[PDB]
Amino acid sequence: HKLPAPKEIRTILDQYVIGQERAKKVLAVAVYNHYKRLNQRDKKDDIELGKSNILMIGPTGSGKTLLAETLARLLNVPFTIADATTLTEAGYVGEDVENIIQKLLQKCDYDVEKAQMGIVYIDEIDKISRKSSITRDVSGEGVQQALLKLIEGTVASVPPQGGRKEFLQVDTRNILFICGGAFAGLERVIQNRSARGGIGFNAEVRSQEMGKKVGEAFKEVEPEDLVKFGLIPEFVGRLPVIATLDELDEAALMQILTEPKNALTKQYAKLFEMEGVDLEFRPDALKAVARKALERKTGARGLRSILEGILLDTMYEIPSQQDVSKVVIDESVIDGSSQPLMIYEN
Amino acid sequence: KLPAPKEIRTILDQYVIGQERAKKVLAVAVYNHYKRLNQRDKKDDIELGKSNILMIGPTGSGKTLLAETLARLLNVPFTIADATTLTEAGYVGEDVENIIQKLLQKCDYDVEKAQMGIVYIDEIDKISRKSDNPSITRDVSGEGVQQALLKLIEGTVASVPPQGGRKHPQQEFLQVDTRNILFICGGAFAGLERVIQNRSARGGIGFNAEVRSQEMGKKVGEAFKEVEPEDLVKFGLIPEFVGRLPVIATLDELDEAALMQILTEPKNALTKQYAKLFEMEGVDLEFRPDALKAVARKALERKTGARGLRSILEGILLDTMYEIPSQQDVSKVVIDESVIDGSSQPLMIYEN
Ligand SMILES: Nc1ncnc2c1ncn2[C@@H]1O[C@H](COP(=O)(O)OP(=O)(O)OP(=O)(O)O)[C@@H](O)[C@H]1O
Ligand SMILES: Nc1ncnc2c1ncn2[C@@H]1O[C@H](COP(=O)(O)OP(=O)(O)OP(=O)(O)O)[C@@H](O)[C@H]1O
Ligand SMILES: [Mg+2]
Numbered sequence: 164h165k166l167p168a169p170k171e172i173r174t175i176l177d178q179y180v181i182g183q184e185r186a187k188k189v190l191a192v193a194v195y196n197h198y199k200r201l202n203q204r205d206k207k208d209d210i211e212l213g214k215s216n217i218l219m220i221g222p223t224g225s226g227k228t229l230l231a232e233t234l235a236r237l238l239n240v241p242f243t244i245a246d247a248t249t250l251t252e253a254g255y256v257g258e259d260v261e262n263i264i265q266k267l268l269q270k271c272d273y274d275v276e277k278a279q280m281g282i283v284y285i286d287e288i289d290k291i292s293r294k295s296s297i298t299r300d301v302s303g304e305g306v307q308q309a310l311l312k313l314i315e316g317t318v319a320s321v322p323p324q325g326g327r328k329e330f331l332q333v334d335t336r337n338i339l340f341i342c343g344g345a346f347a348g349l350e351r352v353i354q355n356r357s358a359r360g361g362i363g364f365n366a367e368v369r370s371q372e373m374g375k376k377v378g379e380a381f382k383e384v385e386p387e388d389l390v391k392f393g394l395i396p397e398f399v400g401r402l403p404v405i406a407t408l409d410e411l412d413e414a415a416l417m418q419i420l421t422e423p424k425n426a427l428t429k430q431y432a433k434l435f436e437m438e439g440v441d442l443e444f445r446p447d448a449l450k451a452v453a454r455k456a457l458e459r460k461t462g463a464r465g466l467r468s469i470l471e472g473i474l475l476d477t478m479y480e481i482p483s484q485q486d487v488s489k490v491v492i493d494e495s496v497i498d499g500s501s502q503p504l505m506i507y508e509n
Numbered sequence: 510k511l512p513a514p515k516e517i518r519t520i521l522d523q524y525v526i527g528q529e530r531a532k533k534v535l536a537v538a539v540y541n542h543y544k545r546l547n548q549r550d551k552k553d554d555i556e557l558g559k560s561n562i563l564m565i566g567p568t569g570s571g572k573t574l575l576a577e578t579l580a581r582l583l584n585v586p587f588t589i590a591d592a593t594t595l596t597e598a599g600y601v602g603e604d605v606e607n608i609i610q611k612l613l614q615k616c617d618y619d620v621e622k623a624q625m626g627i628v629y630i631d632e633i634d635k636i637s638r639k640s641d642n643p644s645i646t647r648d649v650s651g652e653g654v655q656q657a658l659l660k661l662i663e664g665t666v667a668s669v670p671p672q673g674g675r676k677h678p679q680q681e682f683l684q685v686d687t688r689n690i691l692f693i694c695g696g697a698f699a700g701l702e703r704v705i706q707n708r709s710a711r712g713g714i715g716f717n718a719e720v721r722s723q724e725m726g727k728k729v730g731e732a733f734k735e736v737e738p739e740d741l742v743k744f745g746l747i748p749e750f751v752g753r754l755p756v757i758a759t760l761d762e763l764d765e766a767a768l769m770q771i772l773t774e775p776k777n778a779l780t781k782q783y784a785k786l787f788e789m790e791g792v793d794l795e796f797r798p799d800a801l802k803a804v805a806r807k808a809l810e811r812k813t814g815a816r817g818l819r820s821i822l823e824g825i826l827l828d829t830m831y832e833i834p835s836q837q838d839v840s841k842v843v844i845d846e847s848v849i850d851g852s853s854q855p856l857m858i859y860e861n
């Protein structure tokens with residue numbers, strides 16, 4: 164009866180994420196239908212409850228990881244965020260792939276029943292992609308094969324709580340898995356298969372760089388692309404659902420500055436406020452900063468860097484000073500033409 | 510009492526659509542196994558050595574589907590394990606007799622009943638030696654597993670651990686002979702298709718050659734039907750291990766007519782499961798005849814076996830599944846072939 168409205172979740176996520184549409188929808192739909200699977204898991208001839216593992220392709224600073232924690236805060240079942248580099252197949256020190264389940268168990272108080280009703284977010288999945296075999300890819304291809312069966316759903320003897328200086332079993336049948344990585348190079352892959360011009364008089368000729376497009380190219384991704392990247396065909400299939408995130412936008416960067424609950428601006432304001440200066444900005448000022456981030460091609464992270472440099476001088480002077488009450492920022496300050504202006508009053 | 514092969518075959522036909530060859534081989538195996546286990550005493554029979562069968566099918570060919578549905582019909586022990594985690598090279602990790610230990614849980618530590626169990630060690634392509642000639646850093650999850658597993662398939666006593674490992678140093682380790690435990694090893698050999706084609710035509714260069722094309726996906730499911738022991742060794746399987754599995758079954762690829770059936774024919778067919786979920790809130794979900802057929806074409810253009818089917822259905826209804834729950838006053842939502850074409854959107858009746 165819970166039935167948390169798809170929009171409710173989407174809007175809760177909209178409080179922090181500012182711009183993603185496909186991602187918030189797919190997950191919210193997934194979350195909306197995941198409860199139903201467990202809610203109606205009784206024997207009404209609906210017993211297979213086939214799961215569809217989600218994927219999150221896209222570039223950096225797209226909020227791939229931000230969603231998982233915010234999702235965790237509105238999730239009543241167990242949830243954990245896992246890393247891929249740490250995991251390796253057995254026979255190497257690494258980290259055992261099944262260990263990912265143990266992490267979830269701890270958070271749910273080793274409630275096996277509850278544990279089988281949790282979600283996971285395996286970040287940096289693009290890292291384990293294989294090359295193109297000569298030697299065992301303990302961290303790449305190997306990891307995929309080990310995780311392969313887990314995604315489909317098998318039973319394992321997750322370690323039991325207690326150092327112990329009975330190897331309880333746990334089934335993966337109804338444990339949804341979501342893998343989101345910052346795949347680098349996939350844009351080129353899709354561009355090549357779609358159109359790869361070749362020298363010739365009667366052969367189509369196209370530029371190596373396809374209209375200098377990065378965003379919106381992920382929407383054309385297909386299973387073959389992932390296989391070229393290095394993902395094992397079997398693994399590509401294990402995750403039926405695929406999603407994509409645009410790179411960025413000028414409007415989206417101006418909104419992220421203030422709109423999000425825990426925006427970067429608030430942190431600086433809070434800090435400056437405790438220093439005794441009223442941190443302030445301007446509308447055009449905020450827009451100017453966004454332009455800089457787009458040139459850095461670093462994503463949302465870029466924003467932070469720009470702010471610090473402009474405010475480095477002020478963050479070094481203001482503390483010693485005990486007069487300034489308000490510090491405003493103008494487009495001229497972002498441009499650098501002027502120096503950070505202050506109001507020596509109080 | 511032993512059910513006739515045909516019976517088992519038809520039971521599994523209810524879910525599997527097109528694995529006639531595989532369904533027949535397994536049927537004989539279960540049928541002859543029961544007989545052996547039911548006539549295992551001293552009546553003109555000395556050892557009646559078990560015949561271990563192998564399975565090789567493309568992705569999403571139902572290899573996994575068969576074993577669970579098979580398990581539900583079996584009256585003897587049955588366990589599903591994986592070779593990927595097993596890394597027996599006498600260095601670290603699980604051992605090979607722990608796979609039968611899972612079987613003992615089904616048997617409740619019944620030593621005799623364990624000898625009547627069945628095995629499903631799949632994913633035998635993950636242990637295939639990279640080159641078959643170890644040169645540096647002797648494999649841990651490769652050659653080792655093959656060598657270690659060799660003994661069990663041939664048969665040998667097994668020191669399976671008991672329920673716990675703290676009461677006593679030994680806790681009366683159960684002793685279960687393996688010779689009488691039929692092994693059914695089914696793995697998806699990704700790459701065998703090219704290996705077999707190397708033996709079909711040894712494409713050289715010249716007028717009098719047998720030059721082969723660089724793609725063989727059209728005949729990927731047919732490649733398995735031409736498999737031979739020599740091809741398995743090239744892929745990296747120890748020749749000894751190949752011999753321990755005399756029979757080599759094969760699974761074919763899929764068809765546009767077999768995908769349409771799987772969409773609705775099975776008990777928990779994808780379409781049924783989609784409608785089932787859609788029906789919990791109370792909105793009826795229906796699809797036209799041509800609507801379902803459209804999904805089959807897309808499935809064959811993804812080379813993602815039956816799994817691709819599910820994926821396609823997700824994309825077809827994403828925006829509506831987001832709206833439908835909150836969008837009350839929707840008697841039913843019919844689907845058409847246009848919806849799969851991408852021209853029209855889900856037909857929302859939006860009426861009492
Ligand atoms: N849509 C967005 N709205 C607001 N902030 C965002 C958005 N996308 C990213 N961010 C910011 O980016 C930071 C998190 O970056 P994130 O972890 O999503 O990168 P990533 O895509 O996971 O990179 P990688 O995949 O390499 O880890 C947060 O501080 C967050 O404020
Ligand atoms: N012949 C078939 N008939 C009906 N359903 C099928 C068939 N083949 C595959 N499926 C469906 O595909 C899903 C997953 O397929 P499955 O895991 O059996 O493929 P697989 O052979 O194990 O692939 P891999 O060996 O690479 O893991 C199952 O839930 C099943 O319903
Ligand atoms: Mg991240």
Ligand SMILES: [Mg+2]
Nearest residue numbers: 572573631697
């Ligand atoms: Mg399989």
